[PDB]
Automatic annotation (TrEMBL), chain B:
Residues 1-298 form the Peptidase C30 domain. The chain holds residues 2511 to 2808 of 6267 of the full protein. This is ORF1ab polyprotein. Belongs to the coronaviruses polyprotein 1ab family. It is found in: Host cytoplasm, Host perinuclear region; Host endoplasmic reticulum-Golgi intermediate compartment; Host membrane. Forms a primer, NSP9-pU, which is utilized by the polymerase for the initiation of RNA chains. Interacts with ribosome signal recognition particle RNA (SRP). Together with NSP8, suppress protein integration into the cell membrane, thereby disrupting host immune defenses. The replicase polyprotein of coronaviruses is a multifunctional protein: it contains the activities necessary for the transcription of negative stranded RNA, leader RNA, subgenomic mRNAs and progeny virion RNA as well as proteinases responsible for the cleavage of the polyprotein into functional products. It comes from the Viruses.
Length: 288, 298
């Protein structure tokens, strides 16, 4: 039982460099459109973006695709949400079947971290209930995408925008809308309190009992799901189950492990003195 | 600080499928040669391989590369170690600058786990001191490769062969020699006892101090010397520290930024074996050998 990531080859063939008057980041090239963060044209705030994008000369958008050796030429600039839709002359012949899918908190995705239009590293994250990811990005990485795959169909979920001072990262879906109440502005932005995605904590504990001698810190007594949820409301744990569809997986793991979920939940409560606690294992990934 | 995988696009463009009389697995296609495990021609033992390979007809090797729409035709077949080197008529246009490099225990690599010539998952493993990897594989995954990337060159380290009862996996390097004393035969094979790669366990705790909590309450207050630790390590399934002298430059740096000398990390490891009591360190619940000092420091 490993943390599984999706192969990045399809994403690599679409990544492009986007350089606008001394500001460099990444973008993705699908059909005849290149999607990049809008702050490549400057550091603006509020409703200045509409007018500021309209005064942007397309000749200044230097766009290159390193994998294909092509230099793209922009014909029109359209702002959609917090993203820029740059229409180019050439259609990307490497464009796959793709979908723009929003992620619900607690779901996983593969980050294709890129620089200068080239994907450098690939790693795994789960969108937390505070609508932040705990990723890793340096200067010039904006425009990196978080994606999943399902039968050679690219599911784009995320594009990176901003890093906060507690090693948190925020971006948009590919429709241009941020996750949570965060924006692309260099100011302090109040984050909602952290809360554990309980379904995923349950998934990690079951992953441990399946890849190891049942440990000593495993609780000996059961607790009802309802008693856990009254406890969870005062200990920053999400109401269980967070996703009703996860019970098909969780109950299946409870069979393979011969440990009922009621015992796993009481173990979560007793591990409070030790208590980040990590919601990186989803029940789908552990079961399949 | 994350577990970083290398981008797999270079590997996908060269993966192929290899089928022989109903036995199907994966192969990698570099230049004019296709490399795949030898048990695609049968489940033979001992020294039966040299003979059975020389009588295998090349017209029974069905070789497709689905990402390029080509079906390959095999000219010659040569057994190199536990691998078959299938020469084909067509040079691979997507062949990168590559190198066959054998890993030493404690190093990491990215696994491109494929089926029918297409990689379905990528994940990260470390060659353990038993010369096994703790990976994830199903039927038809043989031929999957473990690799790393240094700029432009693709560094091939591993090709998958066999899964053992304890969810451990074994294979060869790209030159054809297995890691450890394991062979491609469906019998029980003795495994050396498990031993933690102490350098990597030190890197995991430092990763926790630098990203999760700078002063966790399981961090030992007192220190132990490297020497006193290594006396304890010989009896507690921990390798002698340091396992690699080149890791010291990374660990000394991690100590300087964490403001916690390695002596306290080593004593923390000793204390955790008697009083971890369910502590979850860098999301792992167990000591992991997945975090290397190089990756955590860089
Ligand atoms: C995109 N090219 C970068 C990605 C950053 C750089 C450092 N790590 C990352 O993930 N994005 C930016 O540089 C941001 C630009 C804004 C206008 C969208 N700026 C930031 O992320 C800054 N963060 C803040 O000011 C904030 F207060 F925390 F929000 C940096 C990280 C530069 C201080
Ligand atoms: C090749 N595609 C597979 C990959 C396996 C299947 C299950 N998980 C894997 O990683 N390799 C095989 O099927 C092996 C073929 C041999 C002849 C090289 N066989 C095995 O791995 C078997 N293992 C054993 O018999 C052994 F005892 F553990 F060594 C299986 C796991 C199928 C029983």
């Amino acid at each position: 039982i490993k943390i599984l990531l999706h192969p990045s080859g399809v994403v690599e063939r679409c990544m492009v460099s986007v350089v606008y008057n001394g500001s460099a980041l990444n973008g993705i090239w699908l059909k005849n459109v290149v999607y990049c963060p809008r702050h490549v044209i400057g550091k603006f705030r509020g409703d200045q973006w509409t007018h500021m994008v309209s005064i942007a000369d397309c000749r200044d958008f230097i766009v290159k695709c390193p994998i294909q050796g092509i230099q793209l030429n922009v014909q029109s600039v359209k702002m959609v949400g917090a993203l820029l839709q740059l229409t180019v002359h050439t259609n990307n012949t490497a464009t796959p079947d793709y979908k723009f899918e929003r992620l619900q908190p607690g779901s996983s995705m593969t980050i294709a971290c890129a620089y200068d239009g080239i994907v450098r590293h690939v790693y795994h994250v789960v969108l937390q209930l505070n609508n932040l990811i705990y990723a890793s990005f340096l200067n010039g990485a904006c425009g990196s995408v978080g994606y999943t795959l399902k039968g050679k169909t690219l599911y784009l979920h995320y594009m990176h925008h901003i890093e906060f001072n507690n090693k948190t990262h925020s971006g948009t879906d590919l429709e241009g809308n941020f996750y949570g109440p965060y924006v692309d502005e260099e100011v302090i932005q109040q984050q909602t309190a952290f809360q554990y995605y309980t379904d995923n904590v349950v998934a990690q504990l079951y992953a441990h009992l399946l890849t190891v001698a049942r440990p000593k810190w495993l609780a000996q007594s059961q607790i009802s799901i309802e008693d856990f949820n009254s406890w969870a409301a005062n200990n920053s744990f999400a109401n269980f189950p967070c996703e009703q569809t996860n019970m098909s997986y969780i109950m299946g793991l409870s069979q393979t492990a011969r440990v009922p979920v009621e015992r796993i939940l009481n173990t979560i409560i007793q591990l409070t003195t030790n208590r980040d606690f990590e919601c990186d294992w989803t029940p789908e990934m552990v079961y399949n």
